Amino acid sequence: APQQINDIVHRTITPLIEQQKIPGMAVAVIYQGKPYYFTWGYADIAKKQPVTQQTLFELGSVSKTFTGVLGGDAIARGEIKLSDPTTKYWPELTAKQWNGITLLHLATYTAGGLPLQVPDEVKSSSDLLRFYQNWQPAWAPGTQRLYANSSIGLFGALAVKPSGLSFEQAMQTRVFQPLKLNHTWINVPPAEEKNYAWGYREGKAVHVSPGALDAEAYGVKSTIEDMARWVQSNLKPLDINEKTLQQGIQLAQSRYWQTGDMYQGLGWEMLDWPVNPDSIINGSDNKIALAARPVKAITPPTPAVRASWVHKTGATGGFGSYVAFIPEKELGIVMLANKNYPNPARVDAAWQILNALQ
Numbered sequence: 001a002p003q004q005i006n007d008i009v010h011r012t013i014t015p016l017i018e019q020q021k022i023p024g025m026a027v028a029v030i031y032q033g034k035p036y037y038f039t040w041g042y043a044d045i046a047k048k049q050p051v052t053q054q055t056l057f058e059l060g061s062v063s064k065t066f067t068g069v070l071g072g073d074a075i076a077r078g079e080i081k082l083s084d085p086t087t088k089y090w091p092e093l094t095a096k097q098w099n100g101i102t103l104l105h106l107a108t109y110t111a112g113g114l115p116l117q118v119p120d121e122v123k124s125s126s127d128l129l130r131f132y133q134n135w136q137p138a139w140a141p142g143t144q145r146l147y148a149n150s151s152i153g154l155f156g157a158l159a160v161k162p163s164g165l166s167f168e169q170a171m172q173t174r175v176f177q178p179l180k181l182n183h184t185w186i187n188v189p190p191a192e193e194k195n196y197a198w199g200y201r202e203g204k205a206v207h208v209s210p211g212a213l214d215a216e217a218y219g220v221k222s223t224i225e226d227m228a229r230w231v232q233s234n235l236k237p238l239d240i241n242e243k244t245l246q247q248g249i250q251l252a253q254s255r256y257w258q259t260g261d262m263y264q265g266l267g268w269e270m271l272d273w274p275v276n277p278d279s280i281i282n283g284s285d286n287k288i289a290l291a292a293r294p295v296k297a298i299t300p301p302t303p304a305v306r307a308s309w310v311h312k313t314g315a316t317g318g319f320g321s322y323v324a325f326i327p328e329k330e331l332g333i334v335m336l337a338n339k340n341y342p343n344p345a346r347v348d349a350a351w352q353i354l355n356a357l358q
């Protein structure tokens with residue numbers, strides 16, 4: 001890598017790994033469109049397996065960006081419309097609080113207070129119908145944003161219904177394969193287990209547990225190479241050959257709602273560039289990011305703005321990920337770690353690196 005990239009990445013990440021006691025980490029910097037990779041530490045402490053460019057990490061909520069894009073692709077295919085009521089795709093959702101709640105509200109966490117987590121007790125498909133039927137919104141739809149797995153998770157499940165494909169099959173066929181993300185998975189195959197890093201929570205090696213709508217909200221595992229390709233795809237959607245996927249990417253970066261200086265896309269979150277680093281750094285902290293906040297509708301949504309800082313944080317019990325890019329500068333970064341460490345530390349490091357290179 002050019003020495004400038006080598007230096008800012010190592011001078012920023014090495015201290016981070018030491019301060020946060022991260023076992024293993026992989027970073028990709030996309031500079032002028034080309035990827036540069038960096039790895040440190042361990043994917044499996046006990047077995048002394050190092051992190052490599054082929055190591056799989058749990059992406060946690062960064063998976064929502066894939067769900068948003070898959071949803072965008074379904075819209076582009078004419079299979080669903082964000083203005084469609086949720087009941088159009090789940091007629092069994094007859095409870096009256098659902099009248100007025102559209103796929104847009106589900107995708108953008110504005111349905112009226114759907115909860116952050118789907119309860120552990122929910123497993124069967126009928127357990128899920130019961131959970132949503134019994135949920136009582138705190139607010140009218142389209143008035144407040146409350147980040148929630150049960151919101152975008154349901155959007156993902158419903159978005160693929162017209163296709164008749166399972167969510168995993170749709171994701172593989174319509175997003176992973178076209179983009180050549182050949183080492184990106186919702187369920188890690190046995191052939192790839194040798195590369196699946198363990199996550200570490202309080203020193204214990206752990207992997208994400210099965211849960212309702214897990215694939216849709218936090219279930220993707222990927223390598224640093226495939227994630228750099230994901231960043232390149234989102235930085236330059238026009239280079240993508242598959243028409244509906246190119247449009248879906250563009251739709252996921254449209255600005256649907258505004259809260260403070262942040263705009264909500266489908267999965268992706270965006271701020272105008274140049275950004276005030278404190279605004280995105282402090283903003284990433286969980287109980288700012290997970291708070292109930294009033295939203296202003298952007299009517300109609302603003303098409304993807306090239307001069308934006310587009311990003312998403314993600315975590316599972318044992319992993320912490322972060323992706324951010326700036327279309328206008330053809331610049332981006334992916335940070336994958338097998339410890340769920342504070343979001344502000346991720347954003348601070350990313351900003352230090354990208355600001356140095358911009």
Ligand SMILES: O=C(Cc1cccs1)N[C@H](B(O)O)c1ccccc1
Pocket residue numbers: 060061062116149208209218313314315316317
């Ligand atoms: O819920 C998850 C995945 C899991 C975290 C712990 C067990 S599964 N992730 C989202 B996302 O990374 O934003 C989340 C939700 C609530 C709090 C922190 C993270």
